[PDB]
């Protein structure tokens, strides 16, 4: 089961969540607010149980599951998650547009010198000031993807209800002194931001 | 002449000799009638009906049967099931299963489908009505259904869902084979089962193939048990009184089981077991100690007919599904074979 | 109505075992399979097994077999039997346990799909021993600089800037919880850029249960 990470809409709207596979089975939905336990919504392809809003309606024909969300309301800023028995989607955060939606800026720190002196090296990638809350984070060696030695967080909202974000990517010196370009690539709503630094320093 | 689907409570029909000390015999005498000497199944010309083993309230009644059998006709030296410690004379008793037919009462039929390749669930072509089943036999058993009926033609997987890693599976085999159970004459407790390696492996190799039939041809892996009390992760069984417990990991060696045959997998499989006093009740969480073996050889010749399976699942990102030896309870017995059988009222 | 209610959450060390009860009440215990699903901060949910508490017969997905079991309580006083309460042990501990457990299950007769959820526990998998934190300089190349406070345990690091005369424009990040079992973070202003070289800049980092102030100045180097 594959569903959008996120997905976004505005108030008075209708809006779509759809997982594919499902092997053609029964199917479950559920919702879940930050910090809470998921809430089943939708059980039997279609049925809501009692106290679950009449805008929330599903279908699923066959491999594709589907989620409707009619007259979208700010408290279905959540995320919403589909099921056949024990597994699940990824889980699509759906956020109800409160402010205009706002590009990521990104800050990429390179190793500090003193660190290197200390035989360790880290590649800082800080995100901030993006709207809605949902960004992919990813890391590369000249061309190459890198996944080992990266740390990144969650996004977590800010001040001014917009999102932040950081992550570490952890080198040694002879790693990182042995390499043309190392870049952080930050994917929000279909659009990607590149950052870069070069050993050669200034 | 229509019916519709219904719940009456049943009563019971046997050979049992008033004369015998059975404790099967004895439980019987009392609680059941005479067998049916003129039984009458008539076809109902070409009519199609919706059978469902996992749904059928005949399976909770006999279940309750043999509640009341098991707590009439066993007793332990000791029963600690609470904040009760009650102490009670345990003579061992004659302990064999007999054959108990399940009637319905004036106003209700049995339906019985006669479909060769019958699963269990769905919908039944050659229908036919009794007033009572064929004789079955209580075996009380986990891991493996002994001493039962088998499959017509073909090896048959019975389950709600498949696809539900918490249904049961039960294999309904089509060729019995031999588990022998001694424990010999002069640890008193130590005892073993014998199995021709041969002949069990091969059938195991039906049972993979056909599973590869319903499992899109992934690779079919057998496990020992995860975890759970001794009485699921052993083949645990009754024989003359005792209570054997035997494992079974020998029973599902898959470097035996495999298209390259070979290995020295074709001789017999020695499964030790033990005969234990401490039991776990299984009417209500509870403790039984009952007296130590009795002397001389203890042994027991069955019929493995079925096997008792689940299945892993959590697999999406793999290739094969794993099983391991056991159920949910005990009424997958009966469900075993009271597959073919469903009461309904005539109105 | 039926309740599930859980304990036994909070910071282990790495490796280490972790021990979660689930307090089950509104219904006969013995008739319903219990359930264990996991959710690391930001991600899905993920099934780690069932429980019956008929005979204690146990379902794990591979990702947890040999780490993970399943066990329960059964209700001992006949006159209060539908009681029980179901343990989940998971052992061998790493950072990558770090997650919110639930204990589930289904509707009457069936185990899937799950109508009711425990509030779930938290468990924290980090560093066995308190260990301060190192201070490192982000140089400008606008004009944003910062500190870099690396591999400290255990949370929170405080971080100002100048004594606290600097307050505009700063953004200190949520720390991010290492395979290490390490915390780090980082924290940023952006200054005018003409002020390079005629303001000085000095990062303030405290942390208390190891007792490290860490003053450092961010200079922007030659090249
Ligand atoms: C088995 O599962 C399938 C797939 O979800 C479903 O269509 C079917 O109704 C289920 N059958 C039973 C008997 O539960
Ligand atoms: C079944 O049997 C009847 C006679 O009882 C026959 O006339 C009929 O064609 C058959 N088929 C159906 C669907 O009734
Ligand atoms: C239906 O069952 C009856 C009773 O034994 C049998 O004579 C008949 O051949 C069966 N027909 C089929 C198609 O299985
Ligand atoms: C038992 O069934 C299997 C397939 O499930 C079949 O290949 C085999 O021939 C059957 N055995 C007999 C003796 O009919
Ligand atoms: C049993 O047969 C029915 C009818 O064809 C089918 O829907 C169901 O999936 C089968 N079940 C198994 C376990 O083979
Ligand atoms: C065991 O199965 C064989 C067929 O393989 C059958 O002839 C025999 O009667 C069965 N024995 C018992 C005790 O049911
Ligand atoms: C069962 O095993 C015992 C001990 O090996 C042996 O004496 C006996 O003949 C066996 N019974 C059968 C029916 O093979
Ligand atoms: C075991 O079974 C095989 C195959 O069925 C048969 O040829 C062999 O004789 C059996 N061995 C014994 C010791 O009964
Ligand atoms: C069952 O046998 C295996 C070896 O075949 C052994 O490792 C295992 O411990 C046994 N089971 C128990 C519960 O002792
Ligand atoms: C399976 O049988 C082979 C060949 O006899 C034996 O070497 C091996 O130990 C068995 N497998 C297990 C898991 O015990
Ligand atoms: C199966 O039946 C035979 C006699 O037919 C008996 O000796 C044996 O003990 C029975 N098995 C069980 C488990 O009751």
Not at chain 2, 118 to 136: A, D, L, M, R
Request: hydrophobic residues 30%.
């Amino acid at each position: 089961l594959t569903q959008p990470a996120s997905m976004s809409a505005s108030p008075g709207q209708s809006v779509t969540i759809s997982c594919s596979g499902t092997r053609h089975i029964i199917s479950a939905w559920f919702q879940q607010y930050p910090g809470k336990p998921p809430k089943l919504i939708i059980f039997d392809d279609d049925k809501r149980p009692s106290g679950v809003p009449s805008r929330f309606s599903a279908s699923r024909p066959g491999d594709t599951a589907s989620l409707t969300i009619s007259n979208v309301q700010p408290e279905d800023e959540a995320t919403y998650i589909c099921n056949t028995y024990e597994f699940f989607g990824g889980g699509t955060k759906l956020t109800v547009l409160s402010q205009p939606k706002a590009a990521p800026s990104v800050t990429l720190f390179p190793p500090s010198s003193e660190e290197l002196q200390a035989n360790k090296a880290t590649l800082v990638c800080l995100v901030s000031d993006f709207y809605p809350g949902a960004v992919t984070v990813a890391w590369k060696a000249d061309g190459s993807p890198v996944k080992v030695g990266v740390e990144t967080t969650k996004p977590s909202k800010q001040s001014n209800n917009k999102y932040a974000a950081s992550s570490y990517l952890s080198l040694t010196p002879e790693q990182w002194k042995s390499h043309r370009s190392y870049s952080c690539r930050v994917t929000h709503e279909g659009s990607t931001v590149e950052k870069t630094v070069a050993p050669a320093e200034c | 002449p229509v019916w519709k689907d219904a719940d009456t409570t049943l009563f019971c029909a046997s050979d049992a000799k008033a004369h015998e000390t059975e404790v099967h015999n004895v439980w019987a005498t009392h609680a059941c009638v005479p067998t049916d000497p003129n039984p009458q199944e008539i076809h109902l010309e070409n009519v199609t009906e919706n059978f469902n083993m996992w749904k059928n309230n005949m399976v909770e009644q006999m279940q309750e049967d043999v509640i009341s059998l098991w707590d009439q006709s066993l007793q332990p030296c000791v029963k600690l099931t609470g904040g009760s410690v009650i102490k009670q004379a345990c003579p061992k008793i004659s302990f064999d299963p007999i054959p108990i037919h399940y009637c319905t009462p004036a106003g209700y039929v049995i339906l019985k489908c006669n479909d060769k390749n019958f699963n269990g669930t769905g919908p039944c072509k050659n229908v036919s009505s009794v007033q009572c089943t064929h004789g079955i036999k209580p075996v009380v058993s986990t891991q493996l259904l002994l001493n039962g009926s088998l499959a017509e033609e073909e090896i048959i997987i019975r389950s709600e869902n498949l696809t539900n890693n918490a249904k049961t599976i039960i294999v309904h085999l089509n060729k019995s084979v031999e588990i022998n159970c001694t424990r010999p004459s002069n640890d008193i407790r130590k005892a073993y089962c014998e199995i021709n390696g041969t002949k069990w492996n091969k059938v195991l190799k039906q049972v993979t193939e056909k599973l590869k039939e319903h499992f899109n041809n992934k690779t079919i892996i057998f496990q020992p048990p995860s975890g759970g009390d001794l009485e699921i992760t052993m083949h645990s069984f009754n024989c003359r009184g005792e209570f054997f417990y035997c494992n079974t990991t020998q029973l599902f060696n898959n470097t035996c089981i495999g298209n390259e045959t070979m290995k020295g997998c074709n001789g017999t499989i020695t499964l030790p077991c033990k005969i234990k006093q401490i039991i776990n009740m299984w009417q209500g969480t509870g403790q039984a100690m009952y007296a130590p073996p009795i002397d001389g050889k203890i042994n027991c010749v069955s019929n493995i007919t079925g096997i008792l399976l689940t299945r892993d699942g959590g697999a999406n990102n793999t290739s094969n599904e794993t099983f391991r030896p056991g159920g949910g309870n005990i009424k997958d017995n009966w469900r075993s074979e009271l597959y073919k059988y469903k009461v309904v009222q005539i109105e | 109505h039926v309740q599930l209610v859980q304990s036994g959450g909070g910071v282990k060390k790495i490796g280490a075992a972790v021990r979660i009860s689930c307090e089950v009440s509104g219904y006969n215990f013995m008739d319903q399979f219990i359930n264990w699903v996991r959710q690391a901060p930001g991600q899905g949910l993920e099934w780690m097994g069932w429980m019956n508490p008929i005979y204690g017969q146990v379902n794990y997905s591979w990702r947890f077999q040999g780490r993970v079991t399943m066990t329960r309580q059964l209700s001992q006083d006949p006159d209060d039997p539908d009681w029980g309460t179901a343990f989940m042990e998971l052992r061998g501990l790493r950072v990558d346990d770090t997650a919110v457990y639930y204990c589930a299950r289904g509707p009457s007769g069936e185990n899937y799909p799950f109508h009711y959820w425990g509030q779930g526990v938290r468990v924290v998998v980090s560093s066995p021993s308190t260990k301060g934190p190192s201070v490192f300089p982000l140089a400008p190349s606008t004009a944003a600089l910062g500190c870099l406070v690396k591999d400290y345990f255990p949370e929170p690091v405080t971080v100002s800037w100048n004594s606290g005369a600097l307050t505009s424009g700063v953004h200190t990040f949520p720390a991010v919880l290492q395979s290490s079992g390490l915390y780090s973070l980082s924290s940023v202003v952006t200054v005018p850029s003409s002020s390079l070289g005629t303001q000085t800049y000095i990062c303030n980092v405290n942390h208390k249960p190891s007792n490290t102030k860490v003053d450092k100045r961010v200079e922007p180097k030659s090249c």
